[PDB]
Design a protein around this ligand. Structure first.
Ligand SMILES: CCCCCCCC[S@@](=O)CCO
Ligand SMILES: CCCCCCCC[S@@](=O)CCO
Ligand SMILES: CCCCCCCC[S@@](=O)CCO
Ligand SMILES: CCCCCCCC[S@@](=O)CCO
Ligand SMILES: CCCCCCCC[S@@](=O)CCO
Ligand SMILES: CCCCCCCC[S@@](=O)CCO
Ligand SMILES: CCCCCCCC[S@@](=O)CCO
Length: 695
């Protein structure tokens, strides 16, 4: 069965770590890759769930909401809470609410880097980054139709077609699209999605490959994305009861939509056995909008001390009345990116070289036209007896609401060089990069204009030792930088923050046995983090520092043609080593322990031939609900099951029917809280039937 050897053999190749084709063992950093075969098996609903059984990442911190693919890697999120995802070696640079998403059914691969890597990609988050590989045209025909149906009125249909147009394979293509409709977990919310992905590959000769990659997506409704207070979730309400799992605190007429257009290409050319040129470019237009009413903690939460509405309440009702605000947003993002690389392979005695040098630049501009409601901008919500009604998003009086109209421009140009020198069984990775990062923000209401031009240099070095049995010990050191976007007291944009990581580990990748096992220890630390000013000024200050260190181990292997086992364990110790206020505490939403195990069996011989069965468990240890560590969030364990049946029997090979069940024991838990007034219920049990037919 396709996914057996895929998760353990194919999953051995990668490029997100070095930009050149390099096997996992020769990469001096922690890198995980999930194949499409695996994704086909699990049917993840997003890219997040596709990383479930990999170490060092929290894929479900935002609970049931699926609006964004936000990932917290090694206890770190990106600047401005924005995503940190790349599509085909190029970053889907977003801004404010404008963040693009790619359905997993359009992906071929998903590789995830852990730790710093600005060495190859410019400004990045300390924790790491995700890189999704689009499906490319197969030179072997593919004609597939798929039908989905399940819990919450989930209805989906999709197709994936690929074939050759010429007779020799000079022109091939791939067209894959889907249409999905479903109700959100929260009452009154729904999600609709429509995507089509046209790809065309032109191969002039055996040394040239030009592949056109386009993607279009329209989402009338993106679903729920609100805030619920801990009182009614983590903690029982004053009447001992807890808000229901599907509770919704937003207006009956809440709306949230997203539209995405992308055009670009990937080009390869090999001159000799010594030189190879490579270029990647994409142009993207993103549009997002929303009319949202969201919770902002109960009336007794110290966060609403200035709410006239809360105040005009008997201080007993104060603990079961939720305050609320709203936001009206509308953004338009334009993004241009090109990365050109020259790859040189040569020798020097007994030393084989693989030199990489490239120029990488990107230009984006986001046009925000929003309107936010402050305190008392929307009628309280009685948690004991909630009443969902419409909200007038237009009637906007300056008494409780003001505009927010910004035009953000970002820019980054970088030059980088890297060598992969190898002597016998020793491998040394050495590389550096220099970045020119300019940014400017124009506030249209105030007429002001803030800008800053950063210059940063980063590098990475590491050693890999290739024992002949598969054991490949290694160690490395890499840096990262992330410019700031917030303004200081002096009316300037703060200085960039930095990431420095040391890591030692081992990778077992035997050529003869189909297994992959990993273990690694690290000390990542983020410097120049923004912290509270040691003064009542509502402004912030630099010089902060957070430090994270831990152990991650991952295991993948087919104990037989019928059994496969995948799992991981993650111990992460993150902490504020120097912050004017939360010093000593551990960042919120970061658990110390994380474990996951999945296994599946398939009957080849017998009456149940072609039948597959799988189960898996992802354990999430406890975590702090706020940076003050004033309350915790209970650990939880979720179990998933699977039932698949090859249809070769009935007459159709390649095709199959499946039944997936997530959160089998329908456990009710809160995924996390980033504060007392910001918690999220986890996802209730879901059952989905999937028919995938191949002609
Ligand atoms: C085949 C599944 C996709 C069809 C979409 C039908 C319309 C969904 S929405 O327009 C109304 C939901 O009640
Ligand atoms: C092949 C599946 C196509 C089904 C989608 C039909 C249109 C739904 S949406 O485009 C308009 C809803 O009012
Ligand atoms: C059959 C699935 C639909 C494919 C996507 C078609 C384009 C949607 S968006 O590009 C324009 C919306 O008006
Ligand atoms: C400018 C600071 C941003 C404040 C956040 C306001 C609420 C947005 S989110 O909490 C709900 C979106 O529907
Ligand atoms: C050779 C034995 C045939 C058993 C197939 C029974 C029906 C399963 S499939 O045909 C429909 C699933 O919903
Ligand atoms: C779009 C509506 C069609 C839904 C078909 C879902 C699969 C049917 S079979 O695979 C399982 C039957 O229980
Ligand atoms: C959704 C329509 C699928 C088109 C495939 C039609 C049959 C082609 S192949 O199945 C046999 C060729 O001889």
């Amino acid at each position: 069965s396709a996914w057996g050897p895929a998760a353990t053999i194919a999953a051995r190749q990668s490029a997100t770590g070095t930009k050149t084709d390099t096997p996992i063992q020769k990469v001096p950093q922690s890198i995980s890759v999930v194949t499409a075969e695996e994704m086909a098996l699990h049917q993840p609903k997003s890219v997040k769930e596709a990383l479930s059984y990999t170490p060092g990442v929290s894929v479900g911190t935002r609970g049931a909401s699926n609006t964004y693919d936000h990932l917290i890697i090694r206890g770190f999120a990106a600047e401005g809470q924005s995503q940190n995802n790349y599509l085909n070696g190029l970053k889907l640079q977003g801004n404010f609410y404008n963040d693009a998403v790619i359905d997993p059914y359009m992906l071929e691969r998903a590789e995830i880097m852990r730790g710093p890597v600005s060495v190859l990609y410019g400004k990045s988050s300390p924790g790491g980054l995700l890189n999704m590989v689009s499906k490319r045209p197969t030179t072997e025909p593919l004609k597939e139709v798929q039908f989905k149906a399940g819990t919450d009125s989930l209805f989906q249909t999709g197709f994936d077609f690929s074939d050759s147009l010429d007779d020799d394979g000079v022109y091939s293509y791939r067209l894959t699209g889907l249409a999905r409709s479903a109700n959100a977990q929260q009452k009154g919310s729904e999600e609709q999605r429509y995507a089509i992905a046209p790809a065309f590959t032109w191969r002039p000769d055996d040394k040239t490959n030009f592949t056109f990659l386009s993607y279009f997506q329209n989402e009338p409704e993106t679903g729920y994305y609100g805030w619920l207070p801990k009182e009614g979730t983590v903690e029982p309400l004053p009447n001992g009861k807890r808000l229901p799992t599907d509770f919704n605190e937003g207006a009956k007429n809440n709306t949230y939509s997203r539209n995405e257009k992308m055009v670009g290409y990937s080009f390869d050319h090999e001159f000799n056995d010594t030189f190879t040129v490579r270029q990647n470019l994409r142009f993207a237009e993103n549009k997002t909008s929303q009319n949202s009413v969201y919770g902002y903690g109960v009336c007794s939460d110290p966060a609403n001390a200035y709410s006239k509405q809360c105040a005009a309440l008997a201080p007993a009702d104060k603990g079961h009345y939720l305050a609320r605000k709203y936001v009206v947003d509308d953004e338009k993002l334009q993004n241009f990116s090109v990365d050109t690389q020259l790859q040189s392979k040569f020798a020097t005695g007994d030393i084989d070289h693989t030199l990489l040098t490239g120029v990488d630049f990107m230009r984006m501009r986001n046009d925000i036209n929003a309107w936010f409601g402050y305190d008392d901008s929307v009628p309280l919500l009685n948690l004991y007896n909630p009443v969902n009604t419409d909200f007038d998003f237009n009637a906007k009086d300056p008494a409780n609401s003001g505009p927010y109209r910004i035009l953000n421009k970002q820019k980054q140009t970088g030059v980088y060089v890297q060598d992969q020198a190898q002597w016998d069984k020793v491998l040394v990775t050495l590389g550096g990069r220099y970045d020119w990062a300019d940014q400017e923000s124009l506030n249209r209401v105030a007429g002001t204009t803030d800008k800053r031009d950063d210059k940063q240099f980063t590098w990475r070095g590491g050693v890999n030792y290739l024992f002949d049995n598969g054991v490949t010990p290694y160690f490395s050191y890499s840096e990262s930088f992330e410019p700031s976007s917030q303004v200081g007291k002096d009316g300037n944009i703060f200085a960039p923050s930095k990431g420095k990581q040391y890591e030692v580990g081992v990778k077992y990748v035997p050529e003869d046995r189909p297994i992959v096992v990993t273990g690694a220890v690290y000390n990542l630390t983020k410097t120049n983090n923004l912290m509270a000013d040691p003064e009542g000024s509502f402004f912030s200050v630099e010089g902060g520092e957070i430090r994270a260190r831990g152990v991650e181990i991952e295991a993948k292997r087919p104990l037989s043609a019928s059994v496969n086992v995948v799992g991981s364990y993650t111990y992460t110790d993150a902490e504020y080593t120097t912050d004017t206020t939360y010093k000593g505490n551990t960042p919120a939403q970061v658990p110390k322990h994380m474990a996951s195990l999945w296994a599946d069996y398939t009957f080849f011989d017998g009456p149940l031939s072609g039948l597959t069965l799988g189960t898996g468990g992802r354990y999430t240890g406890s975590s702090y609900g706020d940076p003050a560590n004033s309350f915790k969030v209970g650990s939880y364990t979720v179990v998933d099951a699977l039932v698949r049946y090859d249809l070769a029997r009935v007459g159709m090979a390649g095709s199959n029917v499946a039944l997936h069940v997530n959160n089998l024991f329908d456990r009710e838990y809160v995924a996390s809280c980033f504060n007392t007034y910001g918690c999220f219920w986890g996802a209730e049990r879901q059952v989905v039937a999937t028919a995938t037919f191949r002609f």
